[PDB]
Amino acid sequence: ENPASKPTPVQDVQGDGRWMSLHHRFVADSKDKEPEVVFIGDSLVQLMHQCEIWRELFSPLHALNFGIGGDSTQHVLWRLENGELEHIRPKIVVVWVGSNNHGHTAEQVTGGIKAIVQLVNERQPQARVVVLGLLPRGQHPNPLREKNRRVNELVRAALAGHPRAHFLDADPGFVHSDGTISHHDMYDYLHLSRLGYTPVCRALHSLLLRLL
Amino acid sequence: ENPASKPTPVQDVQGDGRWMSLHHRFVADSKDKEPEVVFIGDSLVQLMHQCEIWRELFSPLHALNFGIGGDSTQHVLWRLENGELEHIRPKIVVVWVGSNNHGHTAEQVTGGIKAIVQLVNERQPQARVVVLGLLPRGQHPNPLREKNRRVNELVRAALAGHPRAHFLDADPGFVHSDGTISHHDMYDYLHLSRLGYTPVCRALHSLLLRLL
């Protein structure tokens, strides 16, 4: 066990059962809808649906957003196994996870993203799979920048020979010459502003359009 | 020590120093601006600036948003002590924290909010202080609903005799008759949608207008 690729649900240590409620609504979405794109991942996936204009770029494409703030790779794995891929036949699955895998080496997080791609390839063999690169983070140079850049290296080399697996680097150049990330792009140096989402979402919406 | 009212910074166990970067930008805001309202608290404060239209209701009023996702009462206390109230002379300080105080009884969280009100009263004696009630949370009946309702009781009774301390319950009736909270109000049963923020922000914008 890489802990990153061992499927496990987020345990409720708070009391309000929200994670599980999120997961059950997505399962019910899958039972009742027929998306062509399913988006899955952590809060950069999740807030794209609020905080981007999803409705203009991504709703036309017939698209479910199954992002869950705080998810690591292994949580996304558990949710694809436990009913979020039932009853559906997407053409494309977009995956954006790995920046919450705290305490996991870049090689373990890469192993996590590879297990996600593998599960999607078995459970939904017709779909293309898109993996987004992990964005830089923090206001200044720090070790999670180099973690995320190393995951992106190891992931892009892993996907390089998959005909229907696409790695996408959506970073527009968020880190400036002086090393800084501006809070106009990322209000807390991790999560994207409305401004930060635009270039990200049009790099993805293009890729989505070529594929589809 | 109530842990809730013992001032302490969030320690960086991730590596990118974002919390501290957030705090330093707010300190620099305070050094360089002259707000009349400062908003402080957790992510319901923070995302109101993105995810509400802040610019229409709250920007006219000359208003800084110092919300930090994940903050407990004791983290907000530390940030008001360590330079977010320097160089400024607000008329009104709005406080919205306590739903992240996991592992604290409702009485301890109340003790936390009282220490915040006390610090604001000493460091900025001219300001009114508004405390928002803690919103319900989770999709169904659960113990954090009753925690939050008990904090609101103990807080409103604490503030009842303060002439310049105002408790505000902004809840429009988010919990329905069947016990549920809809994901249209709260997308993850905690954080508010654009739709969920509107009634909240106009109850607050009114209060703000009477006071000012």
Swiss-Prot record, chains A, B:
Its EC number is 3.1.1.47. Keywords: Acetylation, Cytoplasm, Hydrolase, Lipid degradation, Lipid metabolism, Phosphoprotein. It is found in: Cytoplasm. It is an enzyme of class 3 (hydrolase). The keyword Glycoprotein does not apply. One of its GO terms (biological process) is spermatogenesis. It catalyses: a 1-O-alkyl-2-acetyl-sn-glycero-3-phosphocholine + H2O = a 1-O-alkyl-sn-glycero-3-phosphocholine + acetate + H(+); 1-O-hexadecyl-2-acetyl-sn-glycero-3-phosphocholine + H2O = 1-O-hexadecyl-sn-glycero-3-phosphocholine + acetate + H(+); 1-O-hexadecyl-2-acetyl-sn-glycero-3-phosphate + H2O = 1-O-hexadecyl-sn-glycero-3-phosphate + acetate + H(+). InterPro entries: SGNH_hydro, SGNH_hydro_sf. Beta subunit (PAFAH1B1) inhibits the acetylhydrolase activity of the alpha1/alpha1 catalytic homodimer. Its main location: cytoplasm. The active site is at residues 43, 188, 191. GO terms for molecular function: 1-alkyl-2-acetylglycerophosphocholine esterase activity; platelet-activating factor acetyltransferase activity; protein heterodimerization activity; protein homodimerization activity. GO terms for cellular component: 1-alkyl-2-acetylglycerophosphocholine esterase complex; cytoplasm. Alpha1 catalytic subunit of the cytosolic type I platelet-activating factor (PAF) acetylhydrolase (PAF-AH (I)) heterotetrameric enzyme that catalyzes the hydrolyze of the acetyl group at the sn-2 position of PAF and its analogs and modulates the action of PAF. The activity and substrate specificity of PAF-AH (I) are affected by its subunit composition. Originally the subunits of the type I platelet-activating factor (PAF) acetylhydrolase was named alpha (PAFAH1B1), beta (PAFAH1B2) and gamma (PAFAH1B3). Now these subunits have been renamed beta (PAFAH1B1), alpha2 (PAFAH1B2) and alpha1 (PAFAH1B3) respectively. Forms a catalytic dimer which is either homodimer (alpha1/alpha1 homodimer) or heterodimer with PAFAH1B2 (alpha1/alpha2 heterodimer). Component of the cytosolic (PAF-AH (I)) heterotetrameric enzyme, which is composed of PAFAH1B1 (beta), PAFAH1B2 (alpha2) and PAFAH1B3 (alpha1) subunits. The catalytic activity of the enzyme resides in the alpha1 (PAFAH1B3) and alpha2 (PAFAH1B2) subunits, whereas the beta subunit (PAFAH1B1) has regulatory activity. Trimer formation is not essential for the catalytic activity. Interacts with VLDLR; this interaction may modulate the Reelin pathway. Belongs to the 'GDSL' lipolytic enzyme family. Platelet-activating factor acetylhydrolase IB beta/gamma subunits subfamily. This is Platelet-activating factor acetylhydrolase IB subunit alpha1. The gene is PAFAH1B3.
